[PDB]
Amino acid sequence: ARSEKRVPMTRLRKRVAERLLEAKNSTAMLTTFNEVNMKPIMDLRKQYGEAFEKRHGIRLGFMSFYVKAVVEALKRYPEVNASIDGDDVVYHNYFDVSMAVSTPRGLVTPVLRDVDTLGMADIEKKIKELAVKGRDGKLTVEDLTGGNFTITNGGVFGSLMSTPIINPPQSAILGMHAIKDRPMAVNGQVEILPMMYLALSYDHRLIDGRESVGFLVTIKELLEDPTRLLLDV
Amino acid sequence: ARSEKRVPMTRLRKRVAERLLEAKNSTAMLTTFNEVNMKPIMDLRKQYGEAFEKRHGIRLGFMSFYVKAVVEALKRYPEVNASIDGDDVVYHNYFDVSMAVSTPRGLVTPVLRDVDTLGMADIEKKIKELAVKGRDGKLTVEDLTGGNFTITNGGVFGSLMSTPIINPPQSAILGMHAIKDRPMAVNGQVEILPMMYLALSYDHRLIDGRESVGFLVTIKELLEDPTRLLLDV
Amino acid sequence: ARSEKRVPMTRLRKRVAERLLEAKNSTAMLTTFNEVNMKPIMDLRKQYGEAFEKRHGIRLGFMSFYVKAVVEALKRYPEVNASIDGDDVVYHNYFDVSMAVSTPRGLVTPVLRDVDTLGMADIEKKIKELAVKGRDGKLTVEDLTGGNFTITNGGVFGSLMSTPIINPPQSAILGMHAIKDRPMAVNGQVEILPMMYLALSYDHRLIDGRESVGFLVTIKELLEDPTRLLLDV
Amino acid sequence: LGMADIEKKIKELAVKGRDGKLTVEDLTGGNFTITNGGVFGSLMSTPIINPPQSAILGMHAIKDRPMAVNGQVEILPMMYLALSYDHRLIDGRESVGFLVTIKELLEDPTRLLLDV
């Protein structure tokens, strides 16, 4: 009936909205974009999916490819794997990557620890585990604290492209989006490819234009041809 | 002659520039994007334009379609139709939408009240009325205050895509852009379609990634096929 | 060995990171985008490159075209050529344009002074000079102070599109990106063109949506057909 | 009622009238009637007015039939419509206009949104 409904914010949500605002005003976030042809990865899933699941007992998804690419990019650009703490820059000699998971009570980012030591099947398993816990609200504070970088996937909701927000106190975040067929120029000919836009938001106080672009280009190259991870080129 | 001209800012403009800065630093604005095929709407205007004007005494434009789509999206995502006031979230049980109109003295946003009760012809009429007033500076403070959301159209100036700024104290804004022919993938074939990019800037303190994307996807679906408004799918 | 390496920030870098943050929170930066077909300029370089170098003793690059376009846009939109100083708006009756150059010790922006008086060959020479100095760290404080606008080129690193950050105390910045073949709609037919996205970040306190879009559209028009600079249309 | 709500009410009444649980309240009233003989394969017919209403719309079977479309012949799923009306109250012009309106809104439901 009444034309307006006023609902008080809980004390928790009070200092949650009053934190991203503090952190968002404490960093110089910028966003850089690129695109990636997902055909190669989609073909690998179709060609080896059955045999992969039979051998590992887990389905080969897209996330393990993203994680592997992010780890390698994190190794090539240590500045992005770092954080700013007071008057110090803290470089991390390990690789923890936060992964956004939608829970009935919002969005949370459980941490995948030492992802650089995990094989692809193991990454898919950990992701499924954390996803299940965050689905049944059994995620612990231990599971949620930490991470040197974050990967969020809005493509599940049909997002074309967007500006992801940095996850405090990390220095950058990778936003994945929907994969959509789009006409592309390939060797002088136009052919339709399953394209996905990538967005990397980064704290310009620590990461410059050159490194943010190079970091995203590295992810693009490793996704368009996973074999590059083996050759290291 | 002099290499520099210093012009003092009026006292009004003083606290106008000193407000968007205050509000812009008080919110966590982010922007998400999508695209829409305007062919269906352009065909409806060509097919029914003449008969529409004869029956209603007003031309069928693009804006009434946008408003109808925004209202439905506002109904499906009440969080976007809300505002943050102090420690409270104010949900609005009505639909007022601010509409950006270029005036000889800048840009203003007159409000379309209870747009959800207006038929398309009635929406086009109100828009033309407010546009005329804002064109002859006869817009009153009453006409300018309020609104739960804003729609701004930069396409008039040839804009491809941009980041619109939130209109205080609203929580989100939809930026429309130029309609340009672009090769698209349609059922395995490449065909040229009149495409327009959409930008939705939103206050992340209140609207999360999932809702901002879902809200924009809803607008996209209702514009690519207005009939969906009738079926409610 | 240790899983973390803490490195103190120098006092200089202390108030460098503690400045872009101050300035970034003191302005209302927004970003607008567009795209440009570089085929015409690429054809001019191929057709006249040899004769240009023989007559001027310098190679005809892309930058002189960008500078010429930016100057003309700066003339058509004086608001963008201005700055905000306290309660005053300072309009500049000259044209100094900062140019981002990557140096072994970071990124710096030497200033091209009175670029509106320089011919294209002269612009290419000045750019090469400043680039060399900034390459051997022989850039003076005089060379680095000033500028009414900035042009930064991330395309060198393969950037598709991004949000450039405003260079204090200027009011806007133009970000150039990589040139990539992309299928486009040309006279009802699809043809592959060398496309580049453009990004213009601007201080909304001084520049409105209409002027930011018009400014970028002007650059686009002058780059897609440099002859327009002669006709002034 | 929204479209989903209309389909639900129709299914409800259909079930009741199928199990004879339709009440006199459910059966009295109505300003107009819609009857569908197409379920039985009817091509076209003259429906009879439901007292004390003034008109009734008869729907029939949908059958593929060659039609003229932009100078070309193409097969379309066509259905004949019949509107019986009490001429004491409704004249030729209004009966025809009423049926033409139904035809236009069915051939392009979007017209309901534009109101044209």
PDB file of N, CA and C in Angstrom, chain C residues 83-149:
ATOM      1  N   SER C  83      41.321  23.845 -17.561  1.00  0.00           N
ATOM      2  CA  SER C  83      41.607  23.181 -16.294  1.00  0.00           C
ATOM      3  C   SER C  83      40.804  23.835 -15.183  1.00  0.00           C
ATOM      4  N   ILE C  84      40.674  23.134 -14.066  1.00  0.00           N
ATOM      5  CA  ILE C  84      39.970  23.681 -12.921  1.00  0.00           C
ATOM      6  C   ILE C  84      41.013  24.005 -11.862  1.00  0.00           C
ATOM      7  N   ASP C  85      41.087  25.271 -11.479  1.00  0.00           N
ATOM      8  CA  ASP C  85      42.041  25.690 -10.464  1.00  0.00           C
ATOM      9  C   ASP C  85      41.273  26.422  -9.374  1.00  0.00           C
ATOM     10  N   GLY C  86      41.059  25.734  -8.256  1.00  0.00           N
ATOM     11  CA  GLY C  86      40.321  26.327  -7.158  1.00  0.00           C
ATOM     12  C   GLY C  86      38.884  26.559  -7.573  1.00  0.00           C
ATOM     13  N   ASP C  87      38.436  27.805  -7.491  1.00  0.00           N
ATOM     14  CA  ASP C  87      37.070  28.149  -7.863  1.00  0.00           C
ATOM     15  C   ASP C  87      37.037  28.762  -9.258  1.00  0.00           C
ATOM     16  N   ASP C  88      38.122  28.581 -10.000  1.00  0.00           N
ATOM     17  CA  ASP C  88      38.220  29.124 -11.349  1.00  0.00           C
ATOM     18  C   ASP C  88      38.412  28.058 -12.420  1.00  0.00           C
ATOM     19  N   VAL C  89      37.992  28.396 -13.631  1.00  0.00           N
ATOM     20  CA  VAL C  89      38.173  27.525 -14.778  1.00  0.00           C
ATOM     21  C   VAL C  89      39.207  28.285 -15.593  1.00  0.00           C
ATOM     22  N   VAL C  90      40.339  27.651 -15.861  1.00  0.00           N
ATOM     23  CA  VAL C  90      41.389  28.299 -16.624  1.00  0.00           C
ATOM     24  C   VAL C  90      41.402  27.798 -18.063  1.00  0.00           C
ATOM     25  N   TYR C  91      41.055  28.683 -18.993  1.00  0.00           N
ATOM     26  CA  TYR C  91      41.054  28.349 -20.410  1.00  0.00           C
ATOM     27  C   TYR C  91      42.423  28.689 -20.968  1.00  0.00           C
ATOM     28  N   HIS C  92      42.993  27.762 -21.726  1.00  0.00           N
ATOM     29  CA  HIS C  92      44.310  27.966 -22.302  1.00  0.00           C
ATOM     30  C   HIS C  92      44.209  28.380 -23.759  1.00  0.00           C
ATOM     31  N   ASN C  93      44.888  29.471 -24.103  1.00  0.00           N
ATOM     32  CA  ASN C  93      44.887  29.982 -25.470  1.00  0.00           C
ATOM     33  C   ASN C  93      46.106  29.507 -26.247  1.00  0.00           C
ATOM     34  N   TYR C  94      46.593  28.328 -25.891  1.00  0.00           N
ATOM     35  CA  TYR C  94      47.736  27.727 -26.558  1.00  0.00           C
ATOM     36  C   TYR C  94      47.493  26.228 -26.541  1.00  0.00           C
ATOM     37  N   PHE C  95      48.326  25.478 -27.249  1.00  0.00           N
ATOM     38  CA  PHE C  95      48.132  24.041 -27.311  1.00  0.00           C
ATOM     39  C   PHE C  95      49.355  23.210 -26.994  1.00  0.00           C
ATOM     40  N   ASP C  96      49.442  22.784 -25.737  1.00  0.00           N
ATOM     41  CA  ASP C  96      50.526  21.936 -25.274  1.00  0.00           C
ATOM     42  C   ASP C  96      49.875  20.581 -25.036  1.00  0.00           C
ATOM     43  N   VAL C  97      50.472  19.524 -25.572  1.00  0.00           N
ATOM     44  CA  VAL C  97      49.912  18.189 -25.402  1.00  0.00           C
ATOM     45  C   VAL C  97      50.957  17.247 -24.834  1.00  0.00           C
ATOM     46  N   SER C  98      50.654  16.653 -23.683  1.00  0.00           N
ATOM     47  CA  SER C  98      51.567  15.709 -23.047  1.00  0.00           C
ATOM     48  C   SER C  98      51.509  14.397 -23.825  1.00  0.00           C
ATOM     49  N   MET C  99      52.653  13.744 -23.969  1.00  0.00           N
ATOM     50  CA  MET C  99      52.704  12.490 -24.696  1.00  0.00           C
ATOM     51  C   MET C  99      53.368  11.421 -23.837  1.00  0.00           C
ATOM     52  N   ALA C 100      52.640  10.348 -23.551  1.00  0.00           N
ATOM     53  CA  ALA C 100      53.177   9.275 -22.728  1.00  0.00           C
ATOM     54  C   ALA C 100      54.305   8.524 -23.429  1.00  0.00           C
ATOM     55  N   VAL C 101      55.435   8.388 -22.742  1.00  0.00           N
ATOM     56  CA  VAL C 101      56.584   7.672 -23.283  1.00  0.00           C
ATOM     57  C   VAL C 101      57.125   6.715 -22.226  1.00  0.00           C
ATOM     58  N   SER C 102      57.269   5.448 -22.599  1.00  0.00           N
ATOM     59  CA  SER C 102      57.767   4.434 -21.677  1.00  0.00           C
ATOM     60  C   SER C 102      59.274   4.540 -21.485  1.00  0.00           C
ATOM     61  N   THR C 103      59.683   4.720 -20.233  1.00  0.00           N
ATOM     62  CA  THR C 103      61.093   4.833 -19.881  1.00  0.00           C
ATOM     63  C   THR C 103      61.487   3.646 -19.005  1.00  0.00           C
ATOM     64  N   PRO C 104      62.762   3.230 -19.067  1.00  0.00           N
ATOM     65  CA  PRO C 104      63.240   2.099 -18.266  1.00  0.00           C
ATOM     66  C   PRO C 104      62.875   2.228 -16.789  1.00  0.00           C
ATOM     67  N   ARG C 105      62.514   3.438 -16.375  1.00  0.00           N
ATOM     68  CA  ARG C 105      62.155   3.691 -14.988  1.00  0.00           C
ATOM     69  C   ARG C 105      60.684   4.090 -14.839  1.00  0.00           C
ATOM     70  N   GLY C 106      59.824   3.524 -15.683  1.00  0.00           N
ATOM     71  CA  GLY C 106      58.406   3.835 -15.611  1.00  0.00           C
ATOM     72  C   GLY C 106      57.840   4.541 -16.831  1.00  0.00           C
ATOM     73  N   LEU C 107      56.715   5.225 -16.646  1.00  0.00           N
ATOM     74  CA  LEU C 107      56.067   5.949 -17.732  1.00  0.00           C
ATOM     75  C   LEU C 107      56.053   7.443 -17.420  1.00  0.00           C
ATOM     76  N   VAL C 108      56.507   8.254 -18.368  1.00  0.00           N
ATOM     77  CA  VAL C 108      56.528   9.700 -18.180  1.00  0.00           C
ATOM     78  C   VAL C 108      55.816  10.392 -19.333  1.00  0.00           C
ATOM     79  N   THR C 109      55.396  11.632 -19.116  1.00  0.00           N
ATOM     80  CA  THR C 109      54.697  12.361 -20.157  1.00  0.00           C
ATOM     81  C   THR C 109      55.322  13.700 -20.534  1.00  0.00           C
ATOM     82  N   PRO C 110      56.330  13.682 -21.424  1.00  0.00           N
ATOM     83  CA  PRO C 110      57.009  14.900 -21.882  1.00  0.00           C
ATOM     84  C   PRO C 110      55.965  15.734 -22.616  1.00  0.00           C
ATOM     85  N   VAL C 111      56.147  17.048 -22.649  1.00  0.00           N
ATOM     86  CA  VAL C 111      55.183  17.920 -23.306  1.00  0.00           C
ATOM     87  C   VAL C 111      55.594  18.440 -24.682  1.00  0.00           C
ATOM     88  N   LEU C 112      54.658  18.367 -25.628  1.00  0.00           N
ATOM     89  CA  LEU C 112      54.869  18.871 -26.983  1.00  0.00           C
ATOM     90  C   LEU C 112      54.247  20.261 -26.925  1.00  0.00           C
ATOM     91  N   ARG C 113      55.076  21.298 -26.964  1.00  0.00           N
ATOM     92  CA  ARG C 113      54.570  22.664 -26.860  1.00  0.00           C
ATOM     93  C   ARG C 113      54.208  23.346 -28.171  1.00  0.00           C
ATOM     94  N   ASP C 114      53.102  24.086 -28.140  1.00  0.00           N
ATOM     95  CA  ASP C 114      52.612  24.801 -29.311  1.00  0.00           C
ATOM     96  C   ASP C 114      52.537  23.878 -30.525  1.00  0.00           C
ATOM     97  N   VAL C 115      52.003  22.675 -30.310  1.00  0.00           N
ATOM     98  CA  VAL C 115      51.881  21.684 -31.376  1.00  0.00           C
ATOM     99  C   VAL C 115      51.072  22.174 -32.565  1.00  0.00           C
ATOM    100  N   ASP C 116      50.229  23.172 -32.334  1.00  0.00           N
ATOM    101  CA  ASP C 116      49.393  23.728 -33.390  1.00  0.00           C
ATOM    102  C   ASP C 116      50.194  24.540 -34.412  1.00  0.00           C
ATOM    103  N   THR C 117      51.456  24.826 -34.097  1.00  0.00           N
ATOM    104  CA  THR C 117      52.312  25.597 -35.000  1.00  0.00           C
ATOM    105  C   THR C 117      53.266  24.682 -35.757  1.00  0.00           C
ATOM    106  N   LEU C 118      53.313  23.421 -35.347  1.00  0.00           N
ATOM    107  CA  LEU C 118      54.199  22.441 -35.963  1.00  0.00           C
ATOM    108  C   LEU C 118      53.593  21.689 -37.134  1.00  0.00           C
ATOM    109  N   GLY C 119      54.410  21.481 -38.158  1.00  0.00           N
ATOM    110  CA  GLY C 119      53.977  20.725 -39.315  1.00  0.00           C
ATOM    111  C   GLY C 119      54.093  19.275 -38.885  1.00  0.00           C
ATOM    112  N   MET C 120      53.578  18.351 -39.684  1.00  0.00           N
ATOM    113  CA  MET C 120      53.636  16.949 -39.312  1.00  0.00           C
ATOM    114  C   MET C 120      55.053  16.397 -39.144  1.00  0.00           C
ATOM    115  N   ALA C 121      55.959  16.750 -40.050  1.00  0.00           N
ATOM    116  CA  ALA C 121      57.339  16.277 -39.953  1.00  0.00           C
ATOM    117  C   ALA C 121      57.961  16.794 -38.661  1.00  0.00           C
ATOM    118  N   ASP C 122      57.695  18.054 -38.343  1.00  0.00           N
ATOM    119  CA  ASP C 122      58.223  18.652 -37.125  1.00  0.00           C
ATOM    120  C   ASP C 122      57.673  17.966 -35.876  1.00  0.00           C
ATOM    121  N   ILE C 123      56.421  17.516 -35.928  1.00  0.00           N
ATOM    122  CA  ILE C 123      55.832  16.824 -34.785  1.00  0.00           C
ATOM    123  C   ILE C 123      56.525  15.478 -34.598  1.00  0.00           C
ATOM    124  N   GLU C 124      56.722  14.748 -35.693  1.00  0.00           N
ATOM    125  CA  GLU C 124      57.391  13.450 -35.619  1.00  0.00           C
ATOM    126  C   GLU C 124      58.807  13.602 -35.049  1.00  0.00           C
ATOM    127  N   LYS C 125      59.498  14.674 -35.428  1.00  0.00           N
ATOM    128  CA  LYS C 125      60.857  14.915 -34.939  1.00  0.00           C
ATOM    129  C   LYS C 125      60.879  15.184 -33.436  1.00  0.00           C
ATOM    130  N   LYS C 126      60.004  16.072 -32.970  1.00  0.00           N
ATOM    131  CA  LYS C 126      59.935  16.383 -31.546  1.00  0.00           C
ATOM    132  C   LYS C 126      59.617  15.135 -30.735  1.00  0.00           C
ATOM    133  N   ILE C 127      58.694  14.324 -31.240  1.00  0.00           N
ATOM    134  CA  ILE C 127      58.309  13.099 -30.557  1.00  0.00           C
ATOM    135  C   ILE C 127      59.487  12.141 -30.465  1.00  0.00           C
ATOM    136  N   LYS C 128      60.250  12.032 -31.547  1.00  0.00           N
ATOM    137  CA  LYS C 128      61.406  11.146 -31.560  1.00  0.00           C
ATOM    138  C   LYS C 128      62.456  11.658 -30.577  1.00  0.00           C
ATOM    139  N   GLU C 129      62.622  12.974 -30.522  1.00  0.00           N
ATOM    140  CA  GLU C 129      63.585  13.580 -29.616  1.00  0.00           C
ATOM    141  C   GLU C 129      63.231  13.280 -28.161  1.00  0.00           C
ATOM    142  N   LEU C 130      62.004  13.610 -27.771  1.00  0.00           N
ATOM    143  CA  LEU C 130      61.545  13.373 -26.409  1.00  0.00           C
ATOM    144  C   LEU C 130      61.576  11.889 -26.066  1.00  0.00           C
ATOM    145  N   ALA C 131      61.253  11.045 -27.041  1.00  0.00           N
ATOM    146  CA  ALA C 131      61.255   9.602 -26.822  1.00  0.00           C
ATOM    147  C   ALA C 131      62.667   9.112 -26.515  1.00  0.00           C
ATOM    148  N   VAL C 132      63.648   9.660 -27.226  1.00  0.00           N
ATOM    149  CA  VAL C 132      65.041   9.284 -27.020  1.00  0.00           C
ATOM    150  C   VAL C 132      65.518   9.732 -25.643  1.00  0.00           C
ATOM    151  N   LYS C 133      65.208  10.973 -25.277  1.00  0.00           N
ATOM    152  CA  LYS C 133      65.606  11.496 -23.974  1.00  0.00           C
ATOM    153  C   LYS C 133      64.977  10.674 -22.857  1.00  0.00           C
ATOM    154  N   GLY C 134      63.679  10.417 -22.975  1.00  0.00           N
ATOM    155  CA  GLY C 134      62.984   9.644 -21.962  1.00  0.00           C
ATOM    156  C   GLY C 134      63.418   8.194 -21.977  1.00  0.00           C
ATOM    157  N   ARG C 135      64.213   7.836 -22.974  1.00  0.00           N
ATOM    158  CA  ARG C 135      64.705   6.477 -23.110  1.00  0.00           C
ATOM    159  C   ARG C 135      66.063   6.374 -22.426  1.00  0.00           C
ATOM    160  N   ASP C 136      66.778   7.496 -22.396  1.00  0.00           N
ATOM    161  CA  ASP C 136      68.096   7.554 -21.778  1.00  0.00           C
ATOM    162  C   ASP C 136      68.058   8.395 -20.501  1.00  0.00           C
ATOM    163  N   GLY C 137      66.854   8.595 -19.971  1.00  0.00           N
ATOM    164  CA  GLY C 137      66.679   9.361 -18.749  1.00  0.00           C
ATOM    165  C   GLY C 137      67.256  10.763 -18.748  1.00  0.00           C
ATOM    166  N   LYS C 138      67.228  11.429 -19.896  1.00  0.00           N
ATOM    167  CA  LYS C 138      67.760  12.784 -19.991  1.00  0.00           C
ATOM    168  C   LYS C 138      66.636  13.816 -20.087  1.00  0.00           C
ATOM    169  N   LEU C 139      65.444  13.420 -19.649  1.00  0.00           N
ATOM    170  CA  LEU C 139      64.274  14.290 -19.675  1.00  0.00           C
ATOM    171  C   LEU C 139      64.308  15.226 -18.466  1.00  0.00           C
ATOM    172  N   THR C 140      64.217  16.531 -18.713  1.00  0.00           N
ATOM    173  CA  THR C 140      64.258  17.516 -17.632  1.00  0.00           C
ATOM    174  C   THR C 140      62.876  17.825 -17.067  1.00  0.00           C
ATOM    175  N   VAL C 141      62.846  18.424 -15.879  1.00  0.00           N
ATOM    176  CA  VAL C 141      61.585  18.777 -15.232  1.00  0.00           C
ATOM    177  C   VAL C 141      60.813  19.753 -16.116  1.00  0.00           C
ATOM    178  N   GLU C 142      61.547  20.562 -16.875  1.00  0.00           N
ATOM    179  CA  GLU C 142      60.931  21.529 -17.774  1.00  0.00           C
ATOM    180  C   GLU C 142      60.172  20.771 -18.857  1.00  0.00           C
ATOM    181  N   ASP C 143      60.802  19.723 -19.379  1.00  0.00           N
ATOM    182  CA  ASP C 143      60.199  18.902 -20.419  1.00  0.00           C
ATOM    183  C   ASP C 143      58.941  18.197 -19.913  1.00  0.00           C
ATOM    184  N   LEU C 144      58.920  17.864 -18.624  1.00  0.00           N
ATOM    185  CA  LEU C 144      57.796  17.148 -18.025  1.00  0.00           C
ATOM    186  C   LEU C 144      56.652  17.955 -17.421  1.00  0.00           C
ATOM    187  N   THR C 145      56.837  19.250 -17.196  1.00  0.00           N
ATOM    188  CA  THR C 145      55.753  20.026 -16.599  1.00  0.00           C
ATOM    189  C   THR C 145      54.873  20.742 -17.615  1.00  0.00           C
ATOM    190  N   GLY C 146      53.576  20.774 -17.335  1.00  0.00           N
ATOM    191  CA  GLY C 146      52.646  21.433 -18.229  1.00  0.00           C
ATOM    192  C   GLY C 146      51.767  20.474 -19.009  1.00  0.00           C
ATOM    193  N   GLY C 147      51.239  20.958 -20.127  1.00  0.00           N
ATOM    194  CA  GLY C 147      50.363  20.149 -20.951  1.00  0.00           C
ATOM    195  C   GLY C 147      48.919  20.465 -20.616  1.00  0.00           C
ATOM    196  N   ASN C 148      48.077  20.586 -21.636  1.00  0.00           N
ATOM    197  CA  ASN C 148      46.663  20.890 -21.431  1.00  0.00           C
ATOM    198  C   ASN C 148      45.841  19.620 -21.635  1.00  0.00           C
ATOM    199  N   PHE C 149      46.482  18.593 -22.187  1.00  0.00           N
ATOM    200  CA  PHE C 149      45.802  17.347 -22.520  1.00  0.00           C
ATOM    201  C   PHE C 149      46.869  16.276 -22.681  1.00  0.00           C
TER     202      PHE C 149
END
